Design a protein around this motif. Structure first.
Motif, mmCIF file in Angstrom:
data_model
loop_
_atom_site.group_PDB
_atom_site.id
_atom_site.type_symbol
_atom_site.label_atom_id
_atom_site.label_comp_id
_atom_site.label_asym_id
_atom_site.label_seq_id
_atom_site.Cartn_x
_atom_site.Cartn_y
_atom_site.Cartn_z
ATOM 1 N N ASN A 344 11.551 21.087 -3.356
ATOM 2 C CA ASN A 344 10.580 21.705 -2.440
ATOM 3 C C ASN A 344 9.137 21.607 -2.973
ATOM 4 N N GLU A 345 8.679 20.371 -3.225
ATOM 5 C CA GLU A 345 7.327 20.070 -3.685
ATOM 6 C C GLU A 345 6.507 19.453 -2.553
ATOM 7 N N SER A 346 5.195 19.699 -2.629
ATOM 8 C CA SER A 346 4.180 19.055 -1.814
ATOM 9 C C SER A 346 3.859 17.656 -2.364
ATOM 10 N N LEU A 347 4.250 16.624 -1.598
ATOM 11 C CA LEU A 347 3.794 15.238 -1.763
ATOM 12 C C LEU A 347 2.317 15.053 -1.343
ATOM 13 N N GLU A 348 1.667 16.148 -0.918
ATOM 14 C CA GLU A 348 0.327 16.214 -0.353
ATOM 15 C C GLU A 348 -0.765 16.297 -1.431
ATOM 16 N N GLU A 349 -0.399 16.699 -2.669
ATOM 17 C CA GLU A 349 -1.280 16.890 -3.831
ATOM 18 C C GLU A 349 -2.113 15.643 -4.150
ATOM 19 N N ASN A 350 -3.376 15.639 -3.693
ATOM 20 C CA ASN A 350 -4.307 14.514 -3.808
ATOM 21 C C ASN A 350 -3.739 13.215 -3.186
ATOM 22 N N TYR A 351 -2.968 13.341 -2.087
ATOM 23 C CA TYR A 351 -2.452 12.191 -1.352
ATOM 24 C C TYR A 351 -3.607 11.392 -0.741
ATOM 25 N N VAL A 352 -3.588 10.089 -1.028
ATOM 26 C CA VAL A 352 -4.487 9.110 -0.456
ATOM 27 C C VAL A 352 -3.603 7.951 0.007
ATOM 28 N N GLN A 353 -3.707 7.632 1.306
ATOM 29 C CA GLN A 353 -3.108 6.450 1.917
ATOM 30 C C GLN A 353 -3.714 5.181 1.296
ATOM 31 N N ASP A 354 -2.860 4.205 0.927
ATOM 32 C CA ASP A 354 -3.264 2.937 0.300
ATOM 33 C C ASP A 354 -4.309 2.214 1.168
ATOM 34 N N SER A 355 -5.263 1.551 0.496
ATOM 35 C CA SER A 355 -6.198 0.621 1.117
ATOM 36 C C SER A 355 -5.437 -0.495 1.853
ATOM 37 N N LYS A 356 -4.603 -1.233 1.105
ATOM 38 C CA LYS A 356 -3.870 -2.402 1.573
ATOM 39 C C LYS A 356 -2.408 -2.052 1.906
ATOM 40 N N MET A 357 -2.232 -1.182 2.916
ATOM 41 C CA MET A 357 -0.937 -0.895 3.539
ATOM 42 C C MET A 357 -0.943 -1.138 5.064
ATOM 43 N N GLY A 358 -2.123 -1.379 5.661
ATOM 44 C CA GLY A 358 -2.219 -2.006 6.981
ATOM 45 C C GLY A 358 -1.735 -3.465 6.912
ATOM 46 N N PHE A 359 -1.970 -4.138 5.771
ATOM 47 C CA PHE A 359 -1.623 -5.537 5.537
ATOM 48 C C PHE A 359 -0.128 -5.828 5.349
ATOM 49 N N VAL A 360 0.668 -4.890 4.805
ATOM 50 C CA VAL A 360 2.117 -5.088 4.636
ATOM 51 C C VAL A 360 2.850 -5.134 5.995
ATOM 52 N N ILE A 361 2.358 -4.347 6.965
ATOM 53 C CA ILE A 361 2.969 -4.176 8.281
ATOM 54 C C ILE A 361 2.386 -5.144 9.335
ATOM 55 N N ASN A 362 1.203 -5.730 9.071
ATOM 56 C CA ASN A 362 0.751 -6.959 9.740
ATOM 57 C C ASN A 362 1.569 -8.176 9.259
ATOM 58 N N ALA A 363 1.882 -8.233 7.947
ATOM 59 C CA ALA A 363 2.629 -9.314 7.298
ATOM 60 C C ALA A 363 4.082 -9.443 7.775
ATOM 61 N N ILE A 364 4.847 -8.335 7.785
ATOM 62 C CA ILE A 364 6.244 -8.329 8.246
ATOM 63 C C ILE A 364 6.386 -8.714 9.733
ATOM 64 N N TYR A 365 5.414 -8.309 10.567
ATOM 65 C CA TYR A 365 5.360 -8.611 11.998
ATOM 66 C C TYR A 365 5.042 -10.081 12.296
ATOM 67 N N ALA A 366 4.208 -10.709 11.452
ATOM 68 C CA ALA A 366 3.992 -12.153 11.454
ATOM 69 C C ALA A 366 5.271 -12.952 11.138
#
Lengths: 786, 786
Positions: A344-366
């Protein structure tokens, strides 16, 4: 044994996703991987666990074909990436021959210097890898590198974006810096080439290594901080640590507020480049990639728990590394972590979404629309895979990728050109402090596929219109040439052309032909001197008045001679003598008024008829009288000679004296038929157009030298005429007449040759010599007979 | 499920001996292999085992270190070797993490294309490939290809040997042919480059494809017919199938024996490719690799049994292939034969040892010596593999192999230079007639390391044979112009040098200087002898005789004049005025003596005195004798003038006559101080230099300007003085002597302009003018007075 994540399906796709860090620098012989990364590791492994659950149940992209996954850690080190690559290859090659299905592609190695080292392996088995971060130039050449295309833009686009920013503010002469290795070198070579097509002259080419001594950043400072009035925009195709060193050097010598550096992708908006040196970089442009944060993931990841995720090995070590808490409930619990925790921990502690994670899901769709182009072109009208597609190839599959396009997850499309280069949609970030002391990166518009749309209402707000690439200004005023200064191109030198020089080139004028010199600003060569000669000069109006006064004195002599025949001297001496001298003088006096003229062909005939026939016929008339007395003087009583070559009449003696008249008329006719009467344009200077008739020195020495020897003939037969008891002292005045003509006759020629407008010297010399002859001969012989 | 032959040891070595044939069975994807080659397969598998069984047993090479082996099949294919290699690079990986043991090197794959595509898979694991057959040009780029040795010659070595043959018989223009694809392109570009720096010119490079139409092979011969007498020899850089086509088309046309063909490594011991075309092949040289027969293998192998060799798969199943038998006793028997085998069969059934059996056992020993470096230089004074060196390294193995060298099995040394290239040791052959109808190859010498070692008394059997195929003949003769024939330097067209041209370079004959004809052997330009004569010639013997008889006749007229004072005129008049005739003309008659002379500063100055001052003195004579009576005419009753220009005595009239002598002298003396007389080499042609001393039209008419006024003054006062009764009509004699001399003295100068030998004209004319003055004054003086 090294663990793997595996998702089932039919057509399984492999991925790298750098889980651990680089192994320790010296432990590479046993290649034991380091610590978990938890921005590139466990954020991206979950990308291929929820996007592969979107595509699973999506009825438009793979309807009733189940897709699968494999994830094999690369540990950021090419040795471990290569060991893992042979496992996909092994099971693919054993499967195609005979629980093991063929892997269709690779979702990309992390870096670029492991993208070369894993593609040289996969090129041999015909399996396309699709990179998401591999921004290096030499991965574009399709001669070596076929099986490599990217959903991230190439370095020629960054080079062109930096050219577009620089050339949108009229900057055209800049210093350059880049970090050693492939990155900075390649990008600077690309940019430096593109610069050389639009007249950019890079003031200072430079290189430096990232961990080179403080002396190397300090000498780099001295080098670049010379020519400060000439170039202030230093293009830095740099990494963050090289720029941190250059800002630290600029702090030390305290030259903080001098010049406006512009960055590259190395230092987008990250603060490790600037922290402690916030004052040196204000009004500093960068470029960064536009990788929009995917909101469709933050929901999924931050609802995950340790106790209910069994498809991700590496996840219990991620929890322990994130939360400092050894969990001895499950195995593989680290000792350095005390304070045992719950799930029962917060994964929210200074959570920042990756810069280059729009690119992994553009890549798999290609990679999942290559399996839609293939599934309909090669298996038309089937649910599930048909037989010809079933043991999946790569040679046809790569073409079904290279012609694939789609829409991404952030509204922007993924599409590949002819060499696997994705579209360049780049942002720009100026850095400035907006509120109290808080230096931040502010978005100020985008580059957009050659369409630069920089917002000047947010760009700087620093100093006024920053001093350009101003070494040698656009000094191209009226009459100016650009000297070029052989060695350098841009720093040409600002210099006027001469008066005669016309602006043919802006770089070099040419002195246009005689007849011409150009207008104002040296543009066009116009017919410049149209200077007039015809009527008069205002100074020559006194010479015109003296020719008029000449014509008055001939009419005064005619008023006493022709209609007053009542004089014994003209009754005893022949009249035809006096008729031919008054006709001579009359011709020589209408002449000066016809002399001052714009010479033409017929007006040149008039002007040579003037000098030739007037002087010769005037003196032929004078010598008809002196020849009549010369014949007496030499044949009567003082010169004893035997021969008598004369006729028996006074009219026949006057006709013999008239024989000599026509011989000078034959001379001048033979001199005119030889060289014609024509006008010539004279250019003794650039503003001088006298337009004088053809009248060479031959035509003024021949007839005039023949009048000179005719004065010598008179002088020989006018010796004792000074003291002879002849007619009323006339004979001594004949000798005086020949002396007063011959003295100015000899004084004429030296002044004539030396003078320029010598035609006024000829009119005044002929007019003065004939009026002194007229005066001396007539004024006693008309005044004593009253 | 292809099998592997393995033997135990401590340090194992892999190899890719091509067991089966290149299977076109369906395509690649079934991967089923062809037949056991038996001349490339099983024959060299026991060669590896024999080679290792000489090394596990001698204490000089690997004492107490045991070698092992792994023989696998490549099936002569690019995509079967690539699957099989993965079991060597999945033993190195698993044996270093975690029986299985590391493989240290890959001994050669046969075919060269496999040796490129299986070494872009062995860079990545740092394992040396040691090729034994891979004759490619570009497997020597140490940037792309680093883990790659080969004990077989490069193709640039063969291209040098090709050039060396053509350079020894002194041929310099030759047509090229090469088979399209890597082999022919590579070796022909090598040969073309080597030709270009050496000074050859390849006549026509009609490079052709192997499997084109018989009309394309016809088109080769249709072109070959151009320059068939000029550049006839072909350098056939081809495989034997292109040569088969080129002799099929040679037999077609019947152009049988015009040129020889010097074959490459593809056609040297290929007899199969000449079966039926032998009549076209005679006199053709070839080139092959020198790979000696190894006896040690042949004795071992031919004594083998089907029941003893347990270490070799494919071998219990090759018995049926070689012997056309089928045994039920062995499992996995082929069905196509039905004569039962035995164990005791002869194995010498047309046994020919491989062309490469001396190249396998050289390659393995290059490894066994390169490990006798490693076991010495990492483990000094140790027995077996020490603490280190285990698992065996990559980049230290490769750096001990590149400096491995020790003598082979056949007395020749294996040794690598820095690019993995073995020594070039090449044989030569040629097809020739040995007995009754016997076209076969005969060895005619060797090429070793750039030294060529042919003996002519076994080659070609023809003295002239193929003519010097040079695009022009050796055009160098005695003094020949070279246009270079700009299409190629060495084959220049000879042209004739001009009369004025010389070779500064042989390759350019160009014009000499004017008056300096191009000397013998065209070594420059040469001046020629001069036309001047100081001492007397026959043409000068006449001139000096005229000079001396002129003096003697003046002594005769003095005998009748000065010794005989009973003259009427003289002794009343001055004797010195009649004498100054002779005194003046003395120098005039001496003109021919020192006129026709050498140009020297004093003698050619004396000749300027002849043209100027001596001629002035010879006319000083004439003006004294005629101007005395002329001035007496003007001063006496016979003609009257305005003054009295004469004194009371004849001694005053002598110095008055000397005023006219003085001005005649002074006129020409004003010029001698301006121009000192310098000898000018005025060249009237290229074949005459002529050397006239300082002379011009001004230089010869210098006295003439006052001679004309002296003669005219004395003519005006002697015009009708002829008619006056003189002493005995001597005024009419004087008037006739001046009249005859004046007109011929004017008519001198058109002959001076027309005729070039001015020295003869002036001396001969002055002799003609002075003789009549004596002949018509002094002879009547003598005849009247006596």
């Amino acid at each position: 044994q090294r663990s793997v994540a595996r998702m089932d399906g039919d057509v399984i796709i492999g991925a790298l996703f750098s889980v651990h860090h680089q192994p320790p620098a010296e432990k590479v012989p046993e290649r034991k991987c380091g610590e978990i990364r938890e921005q590139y590791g466990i954020q991206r492994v979950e990308a291929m666990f929820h996007t592969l659950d979107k595509i699973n149940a999506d009825p438009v992209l793979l309807p009733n074909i189940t897709l699968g996954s494999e994830i094999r850690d690369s540990c950021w080190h090419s040795s471990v990436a290569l060991e893992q690559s042979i496992e996909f290859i092994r099971d693919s090659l054993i499967s195609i021959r005979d629980t093991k299905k063929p892997i269709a592609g690779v979702i990309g190695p992390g870096s670029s210097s492991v993208a070369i080292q894993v593609q040289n392996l996969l090129q041999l088995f015909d399996i396309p890898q699709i990179a998401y971060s591999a921004t290096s130039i030499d991965l574009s050449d399709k001669t070596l590198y076929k099986y490599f295309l990217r959903v991230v833009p190439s370095d020629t686009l960054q080079a062109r974006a930096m050219l577009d920013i620089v050339k949108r503010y009229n900057w055209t002469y800049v210093s350059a810096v880049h970090t050693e290795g492939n990155y900075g070198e390649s990008g600077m070579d690309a940019f430096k080439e593109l610069a050389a097509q639009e007249g950019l002259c890079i003031a200072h080419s430079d290189k430096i290594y990232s961990n080179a001594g403080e002396k190397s950043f300090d000498r780099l400072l001295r080098k670049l901080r010379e020519r400060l009035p000439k170039a202030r925009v230093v293009v830095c195709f740099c990494e963050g640590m090289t720029v941190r060193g250059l800002l630290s050097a600029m702090r030390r010598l305290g030259v903080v507020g001098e010049f406006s550096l512009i960055g590259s992708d190395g230092w987008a908006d990250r603060d490790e480049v600037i922290e402690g040196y916030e004052v040196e970089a204000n009004g500093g442009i960068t470029i960064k990639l536009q990788s929009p944060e995917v909101r469709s993931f933050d929901d999924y990841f931050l609802k995950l728990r340790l106790d209910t995720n069994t498809r991700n090995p590496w996840f219990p070590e991620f929890w322990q590394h994130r939360f400092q808490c050894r969990l001895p409930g499950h195995l593989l619990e680290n000792p350095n972590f005390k304070r045992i925790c719950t799930g029962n921990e917060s994964l929210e502690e200074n959570y920042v979404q990756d810069s280059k994670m729009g690119f992994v899901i553009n890549a798999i769709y290609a990679m999942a629309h290559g399996l839609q182009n293939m599934h309909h072109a090669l298996c038309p009208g089937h649910v599930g895979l048909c037989d010809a597609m079933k043991p999946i190839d790569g040679s046809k599959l790569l073409d079904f990728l290279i012609k694939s396009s789609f829409i991404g997850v952030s509204g922007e499309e993924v599409w590949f050109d002819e060499k696997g280069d994705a579209p360049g949609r780049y942002d720009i970030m100026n850095l400035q402090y907006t509120e109290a002391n808080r230096y931040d990166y502010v978005h100020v518009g985008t580059w957009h596929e050659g369409v630069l749309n920089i917002d000047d209402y947010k760009i700087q707000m620093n100093k006024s219109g920053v001093v350009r690439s101003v070494c040698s200004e656009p000094c191209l005023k009226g009459q100016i040439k650009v000297i070029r200064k052989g060695e350098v191109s841009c720093c040409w030198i600002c210099t006027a052309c001469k008066e005669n020089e016309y602006v043919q080139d802006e770089f070099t004028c040419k002195a246009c032909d005689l007849g011409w010199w150009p207008n104002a600003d040296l543009t066009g060569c116009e017919p410049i001197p149209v200077r007039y000669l015809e009527w008069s000069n205002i100074e020559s109006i006194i010479a015109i008045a003296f020719s008029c006064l000449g014509i008055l004195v001939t009419l005064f002599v005619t008023l006493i001679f022709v209609l007053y025949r009542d004089t014994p001297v003209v009754k005893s001496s022949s009249r035809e003598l006096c008729y031919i001298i008054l006709a001579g003088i009359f011709l020589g006096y209408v002449c000066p008024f016809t002399l001052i003229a714009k010479p033409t062909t017929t007006s040149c005939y008039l002007q040579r008829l003037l000098v030739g026939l007037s002087s010769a016929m005037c003196y032929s008339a004078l010598v008809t009288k002196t020849n009549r007395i010369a014949r007496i003087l030499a044949g009567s009583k003082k010169k004893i000679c035997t021969r008598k070559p004369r006729f028996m009449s006074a009219w026949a003696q006057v006709i013999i004296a008239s024989i000599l008249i026509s011989v000078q008329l034959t001379l001048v006719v033979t001199l005119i038929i030889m060289e014609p009467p024509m006008p010539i344009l004279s250019y003794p200077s650039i503003k001088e157009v006298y337009l004088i008739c053809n009248t060479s020195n031959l035509g003024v020495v021949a007839p005039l030298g023949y009048n000179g020897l005719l004065i010598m003939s008179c002088t020989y037969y006018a010796f004792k005429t000074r003291n002879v008891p002849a007619n009323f002292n006339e004979a001594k005045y004949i000798a005086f007449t020949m002396y007063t003509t011959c003295i100015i006759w000899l004084a004429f020629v030296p002044i004539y040759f030396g003078s320029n407008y010598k035609i006024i010297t000829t009119c005044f010399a002929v007019s003065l010599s004939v009026t002194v002859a007229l005066g001396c001969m007539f004024t006693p012989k008309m005044y004593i007979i009253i």
